[PDB]
Task: structure prediction
Amino acid sequence: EVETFAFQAEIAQLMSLIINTFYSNKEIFLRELISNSSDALDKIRYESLTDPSKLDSGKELHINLIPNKQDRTLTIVDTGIGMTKADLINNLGTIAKSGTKAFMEALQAGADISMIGQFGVGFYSAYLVAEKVTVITKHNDDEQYAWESSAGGSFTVRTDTGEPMGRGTKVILHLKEDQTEYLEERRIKEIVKKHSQFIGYPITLFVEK
Ligand SMILES: O=C(c1ccccc1)N1CCOCC1
Result:
């Protein structure tokens, strides 16, 4: 049972801008997704300080980066707070309408795309490198869901019958054909070292057979 939703017009406009603007410094997508994972992990950590049962779904707080060259996917897994179905529908838990407004003003006032995270909409930087993004998530107060979009103005939400996650979020980037450098170990290591060196959770880069 799959539900299809239209993006709000402002978010569709954000996504078109990210997809269509010539901008070479695409590697910042990974900084932005790791930062989102860190923010999610901070939220479940804070809730656990007064209610340790919040971690019954998983005590470890970490980020895994999983490249798969056969499927052409880079997956960012975290064990943070996750998202409810309502959060997924409401722009993946962001204030994306107001964030887009400010970001588009800033781009016209000199800013560049790399600044997207200062506007709370860094998730959408995934579309610098992905033709399709799938988000699998599990929040303590809801069931496991899959969100997906290839842009084009719509996204889907369905219950996920895949491997249960416990708690957290998995962002699966189905990379564009010309963006496969982001599956190479040396390139991922370089980006994490350059942009994510002060993230306070372990970031494990998985290797491939
Ligand atoms: O920062 C930029 C930017 C674009 C062109 C020239 C200088 C900067 N952007 C990223 C891509 O989307 C638009 C905003």
Q: What stands out?
A: Strands lie at 3-6, 63-68, 73-78, 130-138, 145-149, 154-159, 168-175, 203-205.
